[PDB]
Design a protein around this ligand. Structure first.
Ligand SMILES: NC(=O)c1ccc[n+]([C@@H]2O[C@H](COP(=O)([O-])OP(=O)(O)OC[C@H]3O[C@@H](n4cnc5c(N)ncnc54)[C@H](O)[C@@H]3O)[C@@H](O)[C@H]2O)c1
Ligand SMILES: NC(=O)c1ccc[n+]([C@@H]2O[C@H](COP(=O)([O-])OP(=O)(O)OC[C@H]3O[C@@H](n4cnc5c(N)ncnc54)[C@H](O)[C@@H]3O)[C@@H](O)[C@H]2O)c1
Ligand SMILES: NC(=O)c1ccc[n+]([C@@H]2O[C@H](COP(=O)([O-])OP(=O)(O)OC[C@H]3O[C@@H](n4cnc5c(N)ncnc54)[C@H](O)[C@@H]3O)[C@@H](O)[C@H]2O)c1
Ligand SMILES: NC(=O)c1ccc[n+]([C@@H]2O[C@H](COP(=O)([O-])OP(=O)(O)OC[C@H]3O[C@@H](n4cnc5c(N)ncnc54)[C@H](O)[C@@H]3O)[C@@H](O)[C@H]2O)c1
Ligand SMILES: [Mg+2]
Ligand SMILES: [Mg+2]
Ligand SMILES: [Mg+2]
Lengths: 336, 336, 336, 336
């Protein structure tokens, strides 16, 4: 039975989820029945057709009344800031993909359930009250049919976890510290102006901006063996998309650059295929734009000094995450 | 008699109004008694001390309870989104500088008057209901004591009007069309996302973005003789500050590059001194950052072909406009 | 009769000429037999495969000894700064596409002829000695079989000329002044450093930079009727690709916005089809990236005030020009 | 006896050396007697007066014939690409500050000595044949009167060495790996074009670009205790100036975040004062623009997990290094 999905927050993640669904041929047994944002149908259709970071949408998009028509599929357009008022029950919604950035707790995201939706996937780290936190390819097996509000973790955690898992299995990680150099996002500002975070109040276009992230510690939620073993922070830089994870960790035994790279190569070819990739070419961040993988390990950058290991992975923070959202949706509805 | 002033919206314009006041030694007989924004005093103080576009504030800023202290002057900090609830009558406010971007009509901005303020200057084009629209140096003479809500026009209009006035008097403008190449502002977005304007919905950092502006037609409000003679549009480009007006017009008689430049040079040395400047050096936009003039005519760019004339003027859209706000405040309170 | 072509200077224009040739299915009866630059085959192949502005090359590129193999075609790679030493005669070169920026006169470009090449097309405005200057779609009819060194004009002139030609025929242009807001190019600098042009010595990333261009006057070379009637300058802004022509002109008779737009729509559908395009959608510069047209007229921006008319056209300064180089190559070898 | 200095290569470093000398009141007993570049005196004077990254020069610059006059000091302007032809003997030059980026070995930089100069300081890592490599504040004691060609190391090594030295002394470093997120430099490119380094061949403005750096290994040259213990690489990001060192190392014993910060605070107040600074404010990269320190340690970013420690230091890669060049100049001439 096809899963009926709606996207609440038709932004970078929300739109790129819809785009990923259509660009991959609707591989997932999913039908997008509705989207909700602040704009009218003309605005949502226009932003779907033309994108700066990802170019023009391959398919056709037209407007017909209250509907945005994508490759012949009529998708109802809503503009209501309050989730509890959205007509999810009447549309028979199975899963709400919550991508506004404003309802990341189970209490807040549960407003969709009052509206009549069966389940909700938060497109960000959730509050402590969420039923599960999922990095697809790593721990989707923990999902249960009773789960109703889950988190798909962060783009950073979806890159770090598939990177660290094979290294912990074969070498073991005693402890690790991570820095992610990350593209700016729409929570930042063009020129200095009010923000809750004093550093994010500074022009994203002009500076390297340190900001806190829980992505490294959050790997403990998806891989419990690494709980308490990873910490880190982010440096936001003036790029529109694509980010880099830079993980330094102390391994349990001595290792080499060649062994470390071999471990990740085997993982990319086997268990973690299409989630983790292995790259040996002299590439830059833009070359991974529109790459759907969660973690693009760059073997060219690996450094080893005794037990200290530095591994680096590129990730399209919009495209990889958005494709994983569709994967997690199918897993949640299939979970027993 | 010192004018008691408050800033509603302590953003790019609001903060640089306060900065300009203190950097020039409080030359204007003005005391900034309070500011209002969304943040706490610590946030407003930090953004005052450090700015990307304009560097570090020369003076001292400290926090004391609900007050921000700038060079020993205690300034009350407020955070209330509703202007009618602000305690302007209790603070004895003479003039409210409205810089939020949300109350640009006389009806909406009049909420300050109910709160107890005597007068309001909107830092943007006002609605048709405003008492006056002022480009200081051009038409402040129209101000009256009965005026309570006025507009200081736009940054673009404050640049275009002093440029076009001297040319009209000596050569005459049959008609004119204008393009302003303009730095991005906080109304724009970092990566494509909802906006009321479909072009402003596109990444400011990556594209030249056409947007409508009323600055050219608005020159008719300040100079009725030019009403109906100027039109134009804007192109937003990826710069953090400083913009350029590019005016092409048909003069009433044939002229030359040398005559055009001489007319504006004379205006800069006399009637329009310090509002309009005359530049002959081979400079770029960043060289006009922190220039307080409304219109920096660049003589090196002048082109003339018979009756057609192209003149260009640089303007710091934040710094020049913010200084003009202080000028218009004194003029408004002196009006008889 | 397949034309044997070589690219001297495998830079932005040189590489995108080859990309354009393979992406359109080698529609032109052209075979690129060799390229010349400063690097080894590994470097030229890598830059062919991955590009920031235009993304991944759709085809396959490999290296085999001194050859770069593109979709099965073996292309000799040379690294010699002196054209007279290049092996054009042994390769049977019909046309050298001169894209280094260093041999822009007939005397300098003639070094290729000494090397054994029959003809040379300079990818930029030529010196006074060049045999012809060509904007394809406008004046390729002037080419003659005895011509040996020609110029393909500038990107700007290839945008302006197809725009102004239909307007002169239907309305007449008395005179006009133009401003082109233009992406930075590799002759500019990242942070202030020596340059012959003192304004181009300033950071391209941080400022709007006025620079002289002969593109407007050069329209007289391709449309002699307009000789002496057009002048202008450029403003380089921080975008990596895609530029805008903004032409203000006095028409010979009064007109309207609707009539101006109709004239250009008819031309785009007829005589100038695929060279000039007609756009009515609310787009920004990035949306014309990888558009092969020479001039993408934006009807949404048209302004008319009496006789003064402002028309604006977008152009991909790399992609449109590079596609026109292929057209002009065929036209040159077909000339009788 | 005042040290007579000349600058060979009046670029980012060369010009900022002169600006640092004059802005700090010519504290050093140094007189800049001449500069050498590719341009004429008017071009060099203009670039001295106006800078994008560092704003306008506080002093006065005029041109008089072949001389540039800075705050009343006559400085000879030369334009000769071969050091052996420069008239250093006739000018009585004590020290040549070699800042072109083209003569970084002792053999190449020795051409200045044949030109008649007594000594040469390379403004970059030197070849292995250089007499010494100096991080001022760390190992200037090794300088000798017989030294004639030395290296002032790299901006990165001058930031890393003062950061790591106090931590090694009090805690001990078993091993360490470094990442420096670094502003782009004029060696990189605006849009993809030939470069010896295939990643630096990619647009600096659009991507995060991994590049090799010897800064980590080079700390072994200035502190033999650390030879072989540090390795790393750099990531160039789209910022015009200011960089960040991110050092992860395994300490010999367990420690805490507070202890690490205390060691560096004591070092900043004592042995390494004015070389190393201690910051506790929530700042971003631009806030350290024009900071003369070699290493601006940011205590807010420190992370510690047992023996694994991650410390971060900001450095203005132009301004800090340029000021250190003046320090090293005096130390070299004072050496016995
Ligand atoms: N962009 C990334 O790199 C990235 C990666 C992983 C996760 N995320 C997470 O995804 C979420 C969305 O981030 P984004 O970058 O897509 O943000 P965005 O600002 O691009 O998009 C948010 C969208 O939601 C709309 N919106 C806001 N409030 C709304 C409301 N009350 N009701 C309906 N629509 C509303 C906005 O108009 C906008 O279209 C956040 O939780 C973010 O942390 C982002
Ligand atoms: N920036 C320019 O170049 C420029 C030039 C001329 C005029 N203006 C005009 O000035 C106004 C301000 O623009 P800006 O560039 O400073 O924008 P901004 O976003 O930098 O500043 C807006 C400020 O108002 C605050 N704010 C928002 N809603 C508020 C509310 N209800 N109550 C109190 N504070 C509130 C925000 O937190 C922010 O500090 C706009 O009307 C704009 O068009 C701007
Ligand atoms: N980029 C544009 O927008 C554009 C548009 C139209 C025309 N043009 C013209 O095309 C020409 C090249 O511009 P570009 O943007 O491609 O510049 P570029 O700097 O990207 O490319 C120049 C290439 O030539 C190589 N080169 C330099 N000297 C050489 C020599 N002696 N022998 C062989 N190769 C050499 C360089 O390594 C580089 O690959 C110029 O005349 C320019 O004005 C550029
Ligand atoms: N800019 C930095 O952040 C930085 C920091 C530390 C070290 N460095 C090093 O300093 C050196 C200079 O780098 P930069 O960033 O100032 O480079 P740059 O490209 O800004 O400046 C180089 C200057 O040298 C001139 N020049 C070139 N060839 C010349 C010649 N033959 N004779 C005279 N002048 C010549 C150029 O015109 C230009 O003015 C390099 O070795 C670089 O690695 C740079
Ligand atoms: Mg009240
Ligand atoms: Mg030969
Ligand atoms: Mg000599």
């Amino acid at each position: 039975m096809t899963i009926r999905v709606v996207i609440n927050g038709y932004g970078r993640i929300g739109r790129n989820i819809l785009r990923a669904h259509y660009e991959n041929g609707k591989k997932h047994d999913i039908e997008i029945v509705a989207i909700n944002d602040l704009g009218d149908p003309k605005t949502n259709a226009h932003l779907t057709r033309f994108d700066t970071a990802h170019g023009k949408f391959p398919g056709t998009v037209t407007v017909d009344g209250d509907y945005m028509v994508v490759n012949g599929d009529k998708i109802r357009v809503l503009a209501n800031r309050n989730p509890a008022e959205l007509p999810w029950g009447e549309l028979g919604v199975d899963v709400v993909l919550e991508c506004t950035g404003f309802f990341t707790s189970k209490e807040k995201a549960g407003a969709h359930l009052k509206g009549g939706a069966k389940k909700v996937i938060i497109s960000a780290p959730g509050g402590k009250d969420v039923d599960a936190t999922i990095v697809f390819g790593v721990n989707q097996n923990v999902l249960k049919a009773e789960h109703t509000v889950i988190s798909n973790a962060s783009c950073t955690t979806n890159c770090l976890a598939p990177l660290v898992k094979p290294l912990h299995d074969k070498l073991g990680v005693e402890t690790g510290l991570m820095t992610t150099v990350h593209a700016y996002t729409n929570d930042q500002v063009l020129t200095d102006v009010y923000h809750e975070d004093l550093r994010r109040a500074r022009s994203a276009t002009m500076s390297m901006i340190p900001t806190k992230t829980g992505a490294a510690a959050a790997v403990g939620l998806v891989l419990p063996e690494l709980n308490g073993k990873l910490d880190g922070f982010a440096i936001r830089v003036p790029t529109i998309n694509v980010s880099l994870v830079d993980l330094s960790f102390v391994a349990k035994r001595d290792t080499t650059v060649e062994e470390v790279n071999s471990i990740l190569q085997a993982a990319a070819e086997g268990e973690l295929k299409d989630i983790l990739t292995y790259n040996t070419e002299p590439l830059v961040s833009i070359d991974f734009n529109h790459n759907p993988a969660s973690s693009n390990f760059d073997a060219t950058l690996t450094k080893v000094s005794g037990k200290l290991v530095k591994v680096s992975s590129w990730y399209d923070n919009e495209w990889g995450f958005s494709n994983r959202m569709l994967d997690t949706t199918v897993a949640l509805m299939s979970a027993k």
